[PDB]
Design a protein around this ligand. Sequence first.
Ligand SMILES: c1cc(Nc2ccc(O[C@@H]3CCCNC3)cc2)c2cc[nH]c2n1
Ligand SMILES: c1cc(Nc2ccc(O[C@@H]3CCCNC3)cc2)c2cc[nH]c2n1
Lengths: 391, 391
Amino acid sequence: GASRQRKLEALIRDPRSPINVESLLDGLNSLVLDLDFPALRKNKNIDNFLNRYEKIVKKIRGLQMKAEDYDVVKVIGRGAFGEVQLVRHKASQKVYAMKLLSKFEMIKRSDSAFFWEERDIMAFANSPWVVQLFYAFQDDRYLYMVMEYMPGGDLVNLMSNYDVPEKWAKFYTAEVVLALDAIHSMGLIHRDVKPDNMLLDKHGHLKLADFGTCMKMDETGMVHCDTAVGTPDYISPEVLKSQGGDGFYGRECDWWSVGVFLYEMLVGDTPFYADSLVGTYSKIMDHKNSLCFPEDAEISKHAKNLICAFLTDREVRLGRNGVEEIRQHPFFKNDQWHWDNIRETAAPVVPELSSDIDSSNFDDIEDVETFPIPKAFVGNQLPFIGFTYYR
Amino acid sequence: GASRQRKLEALIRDPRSPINVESLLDGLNSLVLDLDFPALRKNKNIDNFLNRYEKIVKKIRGLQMKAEDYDVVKVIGRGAFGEVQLVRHKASQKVYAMKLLSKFEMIKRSDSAFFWEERDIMAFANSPWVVQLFYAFQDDRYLYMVMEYMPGGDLVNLMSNYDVPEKWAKFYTAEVVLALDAIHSMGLIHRDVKPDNMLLDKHGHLKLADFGTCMKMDETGMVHCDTAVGTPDYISPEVLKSQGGDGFYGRECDWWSVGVFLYEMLVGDTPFYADSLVGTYSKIMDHKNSLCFPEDAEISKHAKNLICAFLTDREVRLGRNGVEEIRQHPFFKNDQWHWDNIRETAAPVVPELSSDIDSSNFDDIEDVETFPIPKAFVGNQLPFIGFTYYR
Ligand SMILES: c1cc(Nc2ccc(O[C@@H]3CCCNC3)cc2)c2cc[nH]c2n1
Ligand SMILES: c1cc(Nc2ccc(O[C@@H]3CCCNC3)cc2)c2cc[nH]c2n1
């Protein structure tokens, strides 16, 4: 009573709330995009609705942040859903990394929610371990995520250029343990921990940048999933088994992937490599027999024990009793950093970068059809309402 | 560039703009109402859109102004689209008159725009001659217009209780000429000028309250209409002829109705009364022969000339050269008011009202099916997006 208008206005001012101005503005743009067809305009309700909102919706699109406000400098990445571009804001002259997700393929492959957790993690984590999202916007064909540009590349590139000693492996693994703990702290399970999603900032420190497979845990820190997700080499046995139905696992699947990552860093090969994907899946499931260290692998007993501690069945895997039993594993005993200050210390490898558009740590890329015209209302832009966000 | 966000925000703060917060909030509520059905939720896009907006939309409806915030004191009117109720705001203890328009019958009879001009005239006219709209809101079944309560009743009630002398007729006609000039000033043609739409305020002064038939004039002060509108007794010949197609008329149709009103006031009968509606239409068209004054009608030559000046074909009707030739007709020569101060002078009849809920000048009323469940998206709440307005 009386303060109900002030309470309602408070919901529209909250960027966490799904009814903020940009989300309400999306609700209108999506409706105009999904009704503006010759076929649907046969409806007297639709045609009169469009006649009074067509002009203003087209003015609003042009007034809002658009793809045209950035100069594409170079395409540095290219997933199945779209490319990651090194862009420069025309007005601010600032260099960001912008991810494009095809609205066609994201809707077409049924995948229309994986980006929500990515959006919320980047926009609101406020963690030094998570790449920050400055602006999320969209157009009829793509979603756009303007994020901080990580100029040092990924850990795949590092491993390809260096024989990683255990002094460096201790470091990168610790930064990954803390980044995952920050994600788990936010009530999420990564599910796609791999060196490809571990980026290095301008000083050589780690940040996790891809969050497509993230999934919110229930009040028991558990997840119910009947679909295998992640990269073949790093999928834990519990996530593989989940494909057959009755999938019930927790955050320990991320610690499995850490162990695969640490093995790859020290050995130079994935622990369960095979030519077929099914050959890799067989080795992962049969880990008790298939996990072995090459006789030329220069690895300590502590490093081997930590890898074996992670590469076991979830029931007895390190990390089941919290992150503290990971942090106090003798492998992390070092005279360069502490868990409370590791990000303030010198990184093993500091990227050499001549300019704000230097993308030397990213391999060159050598350069998504249109949605069909609907006979009846389909509402293809409906899963995208509320994607827009401005920091 | 840069100020584009401030320019965009300025559109959402403007109550005249169709993309203000309440209009954007309507766009969401209408979408949720028109998609929440078992049949439509078979669509993967629709079902997932609803799952993330159902809870918050139902919280927003309850937070916003609702029909339940008013105490219905008495039903005082009852048109074909809905009733006018004398209500009292539960929190403010303030008495308003609230008009309910059936969303079912307004959509069902194809009439889904007549209320727009009424809403804008009342909400934004700021004229002492137009009843003010304080809040416009809506629910799944009705539109709601919370307006100032006119406690003196209409001119039909006055004429039924009094033998109106020409001293009073000069007054009520002048107030009607100024009220229509204010509407014409706003670029509108009333089209339904009748004593039923002329209400008396707490002091006995006039205000026009129904604007359903209003129509915006083009840059030539003309309108293109192929449909007869208004009340049979007061329809001008040009509006009757418009029914046969090729309707092109201006604001002079309102001056015709003024003359019918003045005749009714002085003679006590409508100038073209007949038992059939077609008998009335014949008399209106044949006005040159059918208009006559009873030999017992106590009317002056100036009053008869003004009525005849209004009841002619549009081509030569008084008001074609502006409102000044109406204002200087000798019939208005009086020693009580001037055109510039008529509303500050004493009204002929001041209503006797014991309390803020006294509705003695309104006859007692002796007390709209549901929309069908749609197989495919119909968007029945779409013509109502942007009706909500809070002063
Ligand atoms: C920079 C890059 C980014 N993405 C990104 C792009 C390409 C990547 O690697 C390619 C493909 C995988 C194997 N190695 C080469 C990795 C990450 C982001 C995301 C946010 N900020 C960023 N700044
Ligand atoms: C009071 C009344 C109002 N409507 C209204 C209701 C009933 C009317 O008359 C009945 C039917 C026609 C013949 N005579 C009796 C006229 C106008 C409004 C509108 C805004 N404020 C109001 N305050």
